Write a protein that binds this DNA or RNA. Structure first.
Lengths: 59, 59
RNA sequence: GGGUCAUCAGGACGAUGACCC
RNA sequence: GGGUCAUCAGGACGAUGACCC
């Protein structure tokens, strides 16, 4: 893992083709954004487990 | 962009080799984690501009 | 013991300071 | 107009509800 801190309204980068932006907070909830090509995919870690089961194109 | 809400202590996924975790919250500040192979890079958006300058090979 | 704010930083659920009770 | 809490979700700085002044 690589851990660090950010402030609401700022960003982070990954894989030189992906970007992340902490849009703001709401208590224990945090609104966040992601920016990547459709050449890759993004989901909550639960929704991901419904996909990595053997596919990349659900119903 | 793909926007979401995740609570402190949960995770998200990107591509097929990257994972993210919202480690906690501290007001306008947030602590976040990333998990990917060293075959890819991760940095603050501020540090990123020192790396995309023409080398993609930090100090 | 609890709450709140901020800073430095790296592949580590990172590290540190400050303020209030 | 301001603050606080919560839920659903898609490639959109997403959408909605609730509580307090």
């Amino acid at each position: 893992m690589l851990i660090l801190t950010r402030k609401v309204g700022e960003s982070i980068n990954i894989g030189d083709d992906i970007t992340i932006t902490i849009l703001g907070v709401s208590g224990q909830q945090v609104r966040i954004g992601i920016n990547a090509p459709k050449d890759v995919a993004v989901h909550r870690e639960e929704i991901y487990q419904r996909i990595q089961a053997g596919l990349t194109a659900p119903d």
